[PDB]
From Swiss-Prot, chain C:
DNA-dependent RNA polymerase catalyzes the transcription of DNA into RNA using the four ribonucleoside triphosphates as substrates. It comes from Pseudomonas aeruginosa (strain ATCC 15692 / DSM 22644 / CIP 104116 / JCM 14847 / LMG 12228 / 1C / PRS 101 / PAO1). It comes from the Bacteria. The gene is rpoB. The RNAP catalytic core consists of 2 alpha, 1 beta, 1 beta' and 1 omega subunit. When a sigma factor is associated with the core the holoenzyme is formed, which can initiate transcription. This is DNA-directed RNA polymerase subunit beta. Belongs to the RNA polymerase beta chain family. The chain holds residues 728 to 824 of 1357 of the full protein.
Curated annotation (Swiss-Prot), chain E:
It comes from the Bacteria. The RNAP catalytic core consists of 2 alpha, 1 beta, 1 beta' and 1 omega subunit. When a sigma factor is associated with the core the holoenzyme is formed, which can initiate transcription. Mg(2+) binds at D110, D112, D114. DNA-dependent RNA polymerase catalyzes the transcription of DNA into RNA using the four ribonucleoside triphosphates as substrates. Belongs to the RNA polymerase beta' chain family. This is DNA-directed RNA polymerase subunit beta'. The lineage of its organism: Bacteria, Pseudomonadati, Pseudomonadota, Gammaproteobacteria, Pseudomonadales. It comes from Pseudomonas aeruginosa (strain ATCC 15692 / DSM 22644 / CIP 104116 / JCM 14847 / LMG 12228 / 1C / PRS 101 / PAO1).
Swiss-Prot record, chain G:
This is DNA-directed RNA polymerase subunit beta. The RNAP catalytic core consists of 2 alpha, 1 beta, 1 beta' and 1 omega subunit. When a sigma factor is associated with the core the holoenzyme is formed, which can initiate transcription. It comes from the Bacteria. DNA-dependent RNA polymerase catalyzes the transcription of DNA into RNA using the four ribonucleoside triphosphates as substrates.
From Swiss-Prot, chain H:
This is DNA-directed RNA polymerase subunit alpha. Keywords: DNA-directed RNA polymerase, Nucleotidyltransferase, Transcription, Transferase. The chain holds residues 6 to 232 of 333 of the full protein. DNA-dependent RNA polymerase catalyzes the transcription of DNA into RNA using the four ribonucleoside triphosphates as substrates. Its EC number is 2.7.7.6. The lineage of its organism: Bacteria, Pseudomonadati, Pseudomonadota, Gammaproteobacteria, Pseudomonadales.
RNA sequence: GUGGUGGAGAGGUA
């Protein structure tokens, strides 16, 4: 993501760069909210070989 | 010159009636402070008069003390009286009279004890205060504030998980279980 | 045993075993009502016992602030969820119902 | 383009009930279920106690001789009363009691247009010397009305007029014998029991219809 | 002035939230000038009267003066020029300062209770310096190295990464789309998994 | 069995046996001042 | 205890969005956590000059 | 009681088929309600006509290799997915194309059917097309029941929504509704919003009074 | 034609 942002800034410009940044934040927030990503005790997996 | 106890006070409202020469040194609640006055205290140096507020305050204090001690006498005297009435048969001859006299003596002793204690507390109350030099009579007031939790307040659990409450969205927007139960906090 | 209970005071009929010859039942506990802490927070005590309830020495007749009938209750427990919600819990913030 | 007729309601308890809408377009039920859930949880007009005046009290940071609890617990219990207003919006109530006992919603004076659901709701406990006489003015409102947005001795209270507590819904198919391509909506509604679930549904339908009629 | 921060995800990069009371306190001389200008203020005593009572009128002029006036923000430990940045304030009801989540990395400011100090530039010179040189949009790359500093943080990175995954067997894999809008239409309809190998 | 615990009992997940009760917490301060005071003085108070 | 409490074993359930009504695709951790409020309210923090 | 009942809806026409509509005054909660509801309405249930079947003459299977045209069959089907057709005559029709550059106007028609844009390109020569068009409710992939292809009977190509704060001098925290539309051009987006509104209204007119 | 805060100590936040 950092590389893409840096690349876009040097290619497209600055105004469009910040527009892209805001839109990208909006999408990331929205689809992180859609994602049911959560932490539970079952997530930490202890290998049987341990 | 004093706010009535139990008065809602917005910001800047005068609280104490103080006069300078002849200007006024009246006290006002600071800006940003708004609540309800719940208690007032007044203390006066020895050799200075007791204001009607202090007179009234000492009045209900004395009443409270008197009632408490009277009730304490009441319970023990009732216990003793019913114990005596139970020892004696349904309503020897010398023993019952002796027990009644001893009960009366105990009642008188307890009465005089409690009364002496009350006079002692009264005398302790009527005294003035050792206020600071240059202070004739001092007055302090209290306010109660109901701090509702609002966005920005710091909240922290028990495992070193701090946090600042971001927003307060309505109940619908909260994620709800298939049963319809919504959560309160979204960490 | 509790002789009577009010929101401000509590009287306990003291057990005859644990009492002297005279002044048998005398246990007055005046509950500290709303008072100011050093941090300007309220301090008050609440009765947690009814009339005629037998109490042993050392029982908790009334509990003060942040106490729930003898236990220590600092905050409150609510239904919480662990999921990013519209970025309102972005860094460490809390989304509140 | 089927639309539901003769909304069916079944009762679990005087508070809990189920609402079902038999004829619906395919996939449309989840949309309506969410819409109804949000509007019901949002804005139902309800009546809750907003004012409480006790003769012997000045501010609710005090205690009353003979009363087992401080004033704030009394008003908090009083906040959980389920009442109804049949006639006018605003009414004033009265509760007075002297000597020992437990005061519930029964002790309040009833009225022609005023009636109380939870008569078993304990408000306070009284000792022998316990005596209270409290003046209550209540109102019928819509949303959570705090005291700030709302003579000393009159005590304001925070108002949450919403009578609904939990809303749940699910959708299944409706075998109308014409087409199995239909679906049926189950609405699980649980309130304080003050309002008719059918009345709540009709009110929500009117509100939504007006919001759409803004077009 | 200063207050605690609060994440505003509905904030554009160039704008930041602002409590009403801080806004009216800071810009008080501006309010006085505008009120005397438009005519609802003739004496300044009346102006103080309305600002202390906060008539609905004062909010209009307050929003007007705020409208294009950049505001200056900085955190306590300022270790580089990104530690202090200019924003275009947005009035909000509250006592906390809403902040753009992307800028927290530059400020190194988490929302665990950080307090954020505010300032306002007065001269047209200063406001232009803020808008053209210190606006958050102006400074994207780190002065230490050309690497961008307004970078997606934890949660937005999580969302983006989750979107850009592949499931070996997911609903709607292998079927094609004529346009991105078709893909959005299919996914929002719920008939297509968020991450399935597709042609478009 | 205490009266207070009779109103609510916590299910303790302790597997270990309790070998001695937790001592009074504030005794650290309380013993010090009361020993410094020597309130109860014998014919010869504690030297 | 959870299986005794008739609750999902893994301690996680699929929740429903409160605005879109769409169930989140992954089950999330919910439960009851003892939350505190510290003596750092903004009311005494908001200074302005 | 009474609520915020707006009337000043506005359509900033960003394109002939792409539009913008806004709703300033609204009570805090209904923003998400109406936005999500209308979005799902436009996605789910707008009656429309689209092609679901085609006969690629000379391509027995989908992955048959065809000639005479530079493009491949997948590109062709993606093209003919894009046409917007209004059928005023029936709810069923099968259209024929035969030529041996390909444009949508190259398809013959009757007085019943109508194609929005015959200028749309499909292929290029160096083509007996028999495709069947039907009417439908929403977006239905052929997987959900050349011989078959996906369908999007809904006329809106793209709809998104967002709620931001609505400023009323004495309310100060409300919801503004913002909607963007992109119709297939077969319908005015503002007219599409009207149609969706009438659908949602006619859903519950039985109980509103 | 006029407008009202030193130092020390302790604790705490980021
Ligand atoms: Mg921090």
């Amino acid at each position: 993501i950092s590389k893409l942002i840096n690349h876009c800034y040097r290619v497209v410009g600055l105004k469009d760069t910040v527009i892209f940044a805001d839109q990208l934040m909006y999408t990331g927030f929205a689809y992180s909210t859609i994602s049911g990503v959560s932490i539970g005790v079952n997530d930490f997996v202890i290998p049987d070989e341990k | 010159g004093i706010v009535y106890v139990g008065a809602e006070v917005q910001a800047g409202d005068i609280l104490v009636g103080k006069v300078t020469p002849v200007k006024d040194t009246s006290l006002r609640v600071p800006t940003g402070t708004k609540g309800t006055v719940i208690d007032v205290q007044v203390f006066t140096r020895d050799g200075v008069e007791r204001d009607s507020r202090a007179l009234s305050i000492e009045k209900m204090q004395l009443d409270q003390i008197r009632k408490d001690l009277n009730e304490e006498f009441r319970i023990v005297e009732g216990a003793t009286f019913e114990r005596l009435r139970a020892a004696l048969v349904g309503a020897a001859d010398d023993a019952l009279n002796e027990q009644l006299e001893k009960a009366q003596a105990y009642i008188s002793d307890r009465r005089q004890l409690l009364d002496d204690k009350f006079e002692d507390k009264k005398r302790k109350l009527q005294q003035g205060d050792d206020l600071a030099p240059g202070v004739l009579k001092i007055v302090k007031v209290y306010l109660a504030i109901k701090r509702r939790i609002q966005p920005g307040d710091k909240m922290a659990g028990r495992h070193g998980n701090k946090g600042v409450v971001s927003v307060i969205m309505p109940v619908e927007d909260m994620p709800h279980d298939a049963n319809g139960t919504p959560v309160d906090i979204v960490l | 045993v509790i002789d009577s209970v009010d929101a401000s005071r509590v009287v306990v009929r003291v057990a005859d075993d644990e009492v002297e010859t005279g002044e048998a039942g005398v246990d007055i506990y005046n509950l500290t009502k709303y008072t100011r802490s050093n941090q300007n927070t309220c301090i008050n005590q609440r009765p947690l016992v009814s009339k005629g309830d037998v109490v042993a020495r050392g029982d908790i007749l009334a509990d003060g602030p942040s106490t729930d009938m003898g236990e220590l209750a600092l905050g409150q427990n609510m239904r919480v969820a662990f999921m990013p919600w519209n970025g309102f819990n972005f860094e460490d913030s809390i989304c509140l119902s | 383009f089927l639309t539901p007729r003769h909304i069916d309601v079944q009762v679990v308890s005087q508070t809990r009930a189920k609402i079902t809408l038999e004829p619906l377009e395919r996939g449309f039920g989840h949309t309506l279920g969410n819409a109804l859930r949000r509007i019901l949880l949002s804005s139902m007009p309800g009546c809750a106690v907003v004012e409480a005046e006790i003769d012997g009290v000045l501010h609710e940071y005090s205690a009353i001789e003979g009363v087992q609890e401080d004033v704030i617990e009394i008003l908090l219990n009083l906040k959980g009363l389920a009442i109804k207003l049949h006639g006018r919006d605003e009414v004033t109530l009265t509760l007075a009691k002297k000597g020992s006992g437990v005061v519930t919603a029964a002790d309040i004076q009833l009225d022609h247009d005023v009636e109380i659901i939870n008569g078993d709701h304990v408000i306070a406990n009284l000792a022998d010397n316990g005596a209270l006489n409290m003046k209550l003015k209540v109102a019928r409102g819509r949303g959570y009305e705090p005291a700030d947005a709302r003579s000393i001795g009159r005590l304001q209270l925070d108002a949450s007029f919403s009578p609904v507590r939990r809303v749940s819904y699910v959708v299944e198919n409706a075998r109308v014998e014409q087409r199995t391509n239909l679906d049926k909506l189950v609405l699980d509604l649980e309130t304080n029991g003050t309002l008719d679930p059918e009345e709540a549904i009709r009110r929500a339908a009117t509100i939504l219809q007006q919001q759409l009629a803004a077009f | 002035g200063r207050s605690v921060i609060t994440v505003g995800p509905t904030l554009r990069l160039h704008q930041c939230g602002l409590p009403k009371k801080m806004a009216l306190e800071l810009f008080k001389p501006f309010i006085f000038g505008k009120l005397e200008g438009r005519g609802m203020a003739t004496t300044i005593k009346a102006a103080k009267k309305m600002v202390e009572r906060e008539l609905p009128e004062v909010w209009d002029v307050l929003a007007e003066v705020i409208r294009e006036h950049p505001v200056l923000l900085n955190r306590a430990p300022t270790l580089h020029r990104l530690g202090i940045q200019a924003f275009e304030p947005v009035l909000i009801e509250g006592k906390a300062i809403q902040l753009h989540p992307l800028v927290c990395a530059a400020y190194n400011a988490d929302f665990d209770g950080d307090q954020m100090a505010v300032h306002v530039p007065l001269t047209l010179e200063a406001q232009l310096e803020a808008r053209a040189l210190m606006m958050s949009t102006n400074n994207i790359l780190s002065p230490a190295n050309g690497e961008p500093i307004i970078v997606p943080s934890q949660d937005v990175v999580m969302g983006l990464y989750y979107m850009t995954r592949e499931a070996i067997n997911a609903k709607g894999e292998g079927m094609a789309f004529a346009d991105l809008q078709e893909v959005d239409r299919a996914y929002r309809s719920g008939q297509a998994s968020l991450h399935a190998r597709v042609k478009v | 069995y205490s009266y207070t615990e009779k109103k609510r009992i916590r299910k303790d997940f302790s597997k270990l046996p309790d070998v001695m009760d937790v001592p009074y917490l504030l005794a650290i301060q309380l013993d010090s001042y009361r020993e410094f005071l020597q309130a109860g003085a014998t014919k010869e108070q504690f030297r | 205890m959870l299986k005794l409490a008739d609750l999902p074993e893994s301690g996680q359930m699929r929740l429903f969005d409160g605005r879109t009504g769409n169930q989140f695709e992954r089950p999330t951790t919910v439960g009851y956590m003892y939350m505190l409020k510290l003596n750092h309210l903004v009311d005494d923090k908001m200074h302005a000059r």
